[PDB]
Design a protein around this ligand. Structure first.
Ligand code: GDS
Ligand code: GDS
Ligand code: NA
Ligand code: NA
Lengths: 218, 219
């Protein structure tokens, strides 16, 4: 055949692994292309032709005339809508539930990722240490966890009464938050429903497999 | 009331007016409820039942058994998918281009909004003034405009060879960036394709109507 997809990514980043989880859960074949962000490969003309935003990940579907799509959650939606026909990890397009799923994916993409990412930036990469900025995004991480907790303490999954890509989407950034960004953090005590949700998801065979890969990387 | 939708929103923020544009473009009736964020109305138990994130906007469709959805771009997708059957401002669900439309909407939601929003925060609300932080997000604003420019200099619209909600979605934050977040900004000079794109969208009857409502609301 040749592998169906090419996934432009890098050794270890939260959004690439997120897409990898979707691919593995769907049993889809893919070849990862690891861009060296340190060397600016993602800002080179060759990659800009794939994603003009110059960020990873991006996906090419070789079975669909090399249809190319970027933004990890748009990539995710493309994958489940077209290739999760048995609805193993997604709700059906054309239903009200689909937009609740979409709502949660937008909360992840606009409410979790960018804000956690600023915590990561100010703690690690910003040229000067700014305690008030570090504080600001640490507080936002806890707020976001509280939003998850308020729903997960009331129902088992975010949508569809089954684990979906909506639930999956929060995993990689929450891992970074718990294991790097937050200090003296006790996930299970502070956000019990969310911690338990997180634990179960990581126990899914496909997710656990990728999580082991992630550990082996970076 | 009597109106098909209730739109939870407020006077100043860009995402509510963005949804208002979609509703007006589709000719749908709605009653806006303007919440006072400085009175913590969005963090009250009553609104948290509507959106547990405690942010605006949120939409209730009274014609669809009060189906409720939040996240402005998720609300937008719901509206065009269900109510834009003639595809006046959107591409068709089930196509490939739908996911390109979605891609651009995620770029707006995750690449424009939150970063422009951090420029807003550090420039206006953060209780200490931090030049390196202000500079960081002003820079990112310019980078984002550059991304738009690189595409719009080569094609008329983001997707489907017609104006869609993907194009519309960038308007309100770009307005704030152009007039408030950047200093001595010259849209047409710095980003000519994007500025022309911006200008054309603002000429649309429905958008011009909302833009005036927004202008009066500021004031
Ligand atoms: N919305 C996009 C986010 C993708 C993304 O951020 N990719 C990162 C690698 S993950 S590393 C996490 C990443 N931070 C960065 O990329 C830091 C560098 C950046 N230029 C900056 O100045 O902030 C971040 O905060 N992301 C927010 C999020 O995930 O929502 C990247 O390509 N960086 C190259 C670059 O920007 O030059 C998606 O979901 O696909
Ligand atoms: N992704 C959401 C964003 C919705 C949103 O941010 N609504 C704002 C009003 S617009 S005002 C713009 C807003 N800034 C804020 O909300 C500032 C207060 C905030 N808690 C903080 O600390 O940054 C922002 O940066 N948004 C990023 C974006 O639009 O993507 C709100 O309800 N704030 C109440 C609150 O947070 O308490 C959407 O598109 O619906
Ligand atoms: Na990534
Ligand atoms: Na708003």
């Amino acid at each position: 055949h040749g592998k169906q997809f090419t996934l432009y990514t890098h050794n270890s980043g939260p959004n690439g692994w997120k897409v990898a989880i979707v691919l593995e859960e769907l049993g889809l074949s893919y070849e990862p292309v690891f861009l060296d962000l340190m060397k600016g490969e993602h800002k080179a003309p060759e990659y800009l032709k794939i994603n003009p935003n110059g960020r990873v990940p991006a996906l090419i579907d070789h079975k669909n005339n090399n249809y190319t799509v970027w933004e990890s959650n748009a990539v995710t939606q493309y994958l489940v809508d077209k290739y999760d026909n048995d609805r193993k990890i997604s709700v059906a397009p054309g239903t009200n539930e689909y937009y609740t799923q979409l709502q949660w994916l937008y909360f992840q993409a606009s409410g979790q990722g960018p804000y956690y990412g600023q915590a990561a930036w100010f703690s690690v990469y910003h040229p000067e240490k700014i305690p008030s900025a570090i504080e600001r995004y640490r507080n936002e991480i806890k707020r976001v966890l509280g939003v998850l907790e308020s729903t997960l303490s009331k129902q088992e999954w975010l949508v569809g009464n089954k684990a979906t890509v909506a639930d999956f989407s929060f995993l990689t950034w929450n891992d970074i938050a718990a294991n790097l960004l937050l200090e003296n953090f006790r996930f299970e005590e502070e956000f019990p429903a969310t911690a338990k949700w997180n634990k179960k998801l990581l126990e899914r065979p496909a997710i656990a497999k990728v999580w082991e890969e992630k550990a082996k990387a970076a």
